[PDB]
Amino acid sequence: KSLIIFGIVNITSDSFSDGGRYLAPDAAIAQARKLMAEGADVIDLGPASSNPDAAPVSSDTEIARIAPVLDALKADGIPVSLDSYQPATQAYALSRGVAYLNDIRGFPDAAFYPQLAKSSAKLVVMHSVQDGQADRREAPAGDIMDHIAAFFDARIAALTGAGIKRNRLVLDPGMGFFLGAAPETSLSVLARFDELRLRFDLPVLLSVSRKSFLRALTGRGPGDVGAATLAAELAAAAGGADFIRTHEPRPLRDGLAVLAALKETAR
Amino acid sequence: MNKSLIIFGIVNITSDSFSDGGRYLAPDAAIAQARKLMAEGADVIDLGPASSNPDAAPVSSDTEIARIAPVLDALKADGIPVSLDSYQPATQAYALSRGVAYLNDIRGFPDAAFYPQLAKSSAKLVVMHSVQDGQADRREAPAGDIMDHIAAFFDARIAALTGAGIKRNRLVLDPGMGFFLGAAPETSLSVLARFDELRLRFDLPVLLSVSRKSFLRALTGRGPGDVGAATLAAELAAAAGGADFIRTHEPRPLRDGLAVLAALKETARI
Ligand SMILES: [Cl-]
Ligand SMILES: [Cl-]
Ligand SMILES: [Cl-]
Ligand SMILES: [Cl-]
């Protein structure tokens, strides 16, 4: 009911973590506890780097990396959304009882749906314009919201028809590179994602934190978009976003507390 | 009043010749801070000649003028507009002789003996409400709605000023915040949520200053206790609520945040 914050943790290496661009399972564990301490409700755990330029590791490598992280978060009572598009990793994560699966491919392979149907984990179904084609960087001609709605029309039908109950679904319309090169495309979705909540009567997750289009609206480099991110997340929250996936839970937590305190005053 | 949001960057001179990169800024360090804040997106520098900490010993008007004179020199040469934030009439008089763009008085210009000097200047006037109202020990407004008490303050003070020859459109209304409103964070929250009532009742622009006010600390959680994120959220809320001016210690996060909200609004309108 209240905004749920996903804290981003991406395991980047098998054994060497240096507190910068390299994250190992031991230190992934410390980052997860730190993000919960800063106000996250869930750790959105990625078994590999987010950048498409790194060599994609195997489902076997993803499982080996997340296995010790899942043991300790389960011990801590720390909820996990397992962020992987690889079905063998998804199946392993479901066997460990994760709270969510988060698939940047949006669960496109119907042969896998019986395994999704027999679990209770919630599914973050993400839209992208790539849809499996790295070369495809834009949606088809027309209104981006029209194409996203039509994507979810078809995919929700496929998933729920296979027995995945619709109240397990969380809709992620995509953001930044998953929508197109132009900042206007991401701004349209950030402004209009509640059209999807209303169309489907389903919750929406957004991930805007540190996305490149924010740097276009500010003119600053990578380590200076903290305020633009907070403003974008607060605007999403005020627009009714049910989940926000972020790198820095504390500024968002603090900002939300101010907004909550203001509306409670005007009641 | 229909123009875009105007940002005042806060710069206080807190020493005569001591600069430590932290709380103490001599005039040359205040010049460097003023220049930085405009580069970070301020439109005007709200320049205080002394510490705004109530536990600092107040300095004489002679000391205030000596501190601000070289800062006004430098900012005039830079073309940087100044709101001179001082409550001492002698300092205000000096600022007016230097042609500052605004005067900003935490006492709200309460002394009619000074009005003839206000009336023959062109400086815009930031008229600040406080529950102290000279009674510095007074910590709370009288019984009733705080917003009703603020409106009644501006009712009388606007009439007093405009009748003395100060044209109405020189006036900017600051309802006060934090200590100037009361001890309870709910009281500052009430003004932050409802100041639009003052814009409607007087048809005058409203200035808000929430930056780093202690009441925000009650809304941060457990942790180191940084207030920058809570400050930005309150300032963005004020902007969305129609604030004409925002006075802040950090213009850059606010400019960045406003640019996001503007692009979103433009997206929705088109
Ligand atoms: Cl287990
Ligand atoms: Cl819903
Ligand atoms: Cl201080
Ligand atoms: Cl001059």
Residue numbers in the entry:
A (entry chain A): 3 to 269
B (entry chain C): 1 to 270
Task: Pull text from the paper.
The sulfonamides (sulfas) are the oldest class of antibacterial drugs and inhibit the bacterial dihydropteroate synthase (DHPS, encoded by folP), through chemical mimicry of its co-substrate p-aminobenzoic acid (pABA). Resistance to sulfa drugs is mediated either by mutations in folP or acquisition of sul genes, which code for sulfa-insensitive, divergent DHPS enzymes. DHPS catalyzes the condensation of para-aminobenzoic acid (pABA) and 6-hydroxymethyl-7,8-dihydropterin pyrophosphate (DHPP), producing 7,8-dihydropteroic acid (7,8-DHP); this compound is further transformed, ultimately leading to tetrahydrofolate, an essential precursor for DNA and RNA synthesis. All three Sul enzymes adopted the (ɑ/β)8 TIM barrel fold also shared by DHPS.
We determined the crystal structure of Sul1 in a ligand-bound state, and the Sul2 and Sul3 enzymes in both apo and ligand-bound forms to resolutions between 1.74 to 2.8 Å. Comparison of Sul apo and ligand-bound structures revealed conformational changes in these three loops triggered by ligand binding. In particular, loop 1 is oriented further away from the ligand-binding cleft in the apo structures of Sul2 and Sul3 as compared to the structures of these enzymes in 7,8-DHP or pABA-bound states. Similarly, loop 3 in Sul2 and Sul3 also undergoes a large conformational change upon binding of pABA or 7,8-DHP. Finally, in the Sul2 and Sul3 structures, loop 2 undergoes conformational changes in a more confined space in presence of the ligands. We noticed that the Phe residue that is conserved across Sul enzymes (Phe178 in Sul1, Phe179 in Sul2 and Phe177 in Sul3) and localized to the active site adopted different rotamer conformations depending on ligand binding. In general, the sidechain of this residue and its environment (ɑ6) showed higher crystallographic B-factors than the average protein (i.e., for the Sul2 apo structure, B-factor of Phe179 sidechain atoms were 32 to 67, for ɑ6: 20 to 53, and for the protein average: 36).
